[PDB]
Scaffold this active site. Structure first.
Site, PDB file in Angstrom:
ATOM      1  N   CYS A 140       0.846  -1.184   0.000  1.00 52.40           N
ATOM      2  CA  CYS A 140       0.000   0.000   0.000  1.00 52.40           C
ATOM      3  C   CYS A 140       0.883   1.235   0.000  1.00 52.40           C
ATOM      4  O   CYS A 140       1.959   1.239   0.601  1.00 52.40           O
ATOM      5  CB  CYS A 140      -0.928   0.036   1.216  1.00 52.40           C
ATOM      6  SG  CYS A 140      -2.086  -1.349   1.304  1.00 52.40           S
ATOM      7  N   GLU A 174       1.006  -3.615  -5.562  1.00 53.67           N
ATOM      8  CA  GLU A 174      -0.158  -4.464  -5.377  1.00 53.67           C
ATOM      9  C   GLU A 174      -1.410  -3.746  -5.871  1.00 53.67           C
ATOM     10  O   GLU A 174      -1.589  -2.546  -5.646  1.00 53.67           O
ATOM     11  CB  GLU A 174      -0.285  -4.829  -3.900  1.00 53.67           C
ATOM     12  CG  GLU A 174      -1.221  -5.968  -3.597  1.00 53.67           C
ATOM     13  CD  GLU A 174      -1.201  -6.342  -2.129  1.00 53.67           C
ATOM     14  OE1 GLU A 174      -0.110  -6.289  -1.512  1.00 53.67           O
ATOM     15  OE2 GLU A 174      -2.275  -6.678  -1.591  1.00 53.67           O
TER      16      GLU A 174
END
Ligand SMILES: CCOc1cc(C)c(F)c(C(=O)NNS(=O)(=O)c2ccc3ccccc3c2)c1
Ligand code: NA
Ligand SMILES: [Zn+2]
Length: 268
Positions: A140, A174
């Site tokens: 993140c 991601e």
């Protein structure tokens, strides 16, 4: 009732998404966060008392990057569990797709700070799996709203790829990305590939930049700089077309650059 507004440092910031702070904290009108140790508090009075007691003036962990007043701290989720949990709770207020806040042990956190006389002020961060089976060099990534679109996210993206270069690997963030993250990564990939093409195969650009071949290919397609021949993508660009693309205003802002010389990091 959820947390809908925070006070951190000298900023008041409205929340974007639900973050699972304890119930008795969400009910408050505002949550107050120490910008250095990330302790969250219910009241202005406990906040003011904490600020006179807290001895932290920078994130924990090791300062793996320092140039002028720009700093990056590397924080192991197992070594600094509470800090990394509070960081994830903070980040979740501004990330829709973040799902992990308390199981921070598998992660390492890279904290970006801007330093002045009083201390190192948090700007944003990215987390990263110590072991990524999927080849993700970012889990993140979040820039606090008052620092967004001011070059700090570009710095953090560039930084994540500098780590991948030192690890002799390619990597990709991601998915899914936030909308600002999506725009930011596509512009970063474009800027890097265009600059290298101005100054190569797709595999060559991948080894030079640590951007995956897939992300290079999708970026080159968006720029219409690739041909297809018998099942293989092939770079098709003239040195003049590269210049014309770099002319676009979106590359005109002067970046906060990652100076490889100031990066103090050895691959695990
Ligand atoms: C809540 C989401 O939080 C985020 C996450 C990410 C990954 C961000 F990147 C940001 C952000 O703030 N982006 N804007 S940026 O830093 O000025 C920028 C970024 C890439 C650039 C590439 C080429 C030329 C200029 C660029 C400027 C905010
Ligand atoms: Na705000
Ligand atoms: Zn504190």
């Amino acid at each position: 009732k959820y947390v809908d507004k925070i006070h951190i440092g000298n900023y008041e910031i409205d929340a974007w998404y639900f973050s699972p702070f304890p119930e008795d904290y969400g009910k408050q009108p505002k949550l107050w966060l120490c910008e250095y140790c990330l302790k969250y508090m219910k009241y202005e009075k406990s906040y003011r008392f904490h600020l006179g007691q807290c001895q932290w003036r920078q994130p924990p962990g090791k300062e793996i990057y320092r140039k002028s007043n720009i700093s990056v701290h590397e924080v192991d989720g197992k070594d600094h569990k509470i800090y990394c949990q509070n960081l994830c709770l903070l980040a979740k207020l501004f990330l829709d797709h973040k799902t992990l806040y308390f199981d921070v042990e598998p992660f390492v956190f890279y904290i970006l700070t801007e330093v002045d006389r009083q201390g190192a002020h948090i700007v944003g961060y990215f987390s990263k799996e110590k072991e990524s089976p999927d080849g993700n060099n970012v889990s993140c990534i979040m820039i606090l709203p008052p620092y967004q679109r001011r070059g700090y996210g570009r710095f953090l993206i560039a930084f994540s790829y500098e780590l991948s270069k030192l690890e002799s690997t390619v990597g990709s963030p991601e998915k899914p990305l936030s909308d600002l993250g999506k725009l930011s990564y596509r512009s970063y990939w474009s800027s890097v590939l265009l600059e290298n093409l101005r100054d190569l195969s797709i595999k060559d650009l991948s080894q030079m930049t640590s951007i995956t071949q897939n992300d290079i290919i999708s970026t080159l397609q968006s720029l219409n700089m690739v041909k297809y021949w018998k099942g293989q993508h092939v770079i098709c660009v003239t040195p003049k077309l590269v210049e014309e693309h770099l002319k676009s205003a979106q590359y005109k802002k002067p970046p906060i650059t990652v100076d490889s010389v100031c990066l103090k990091w050895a691959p695990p």
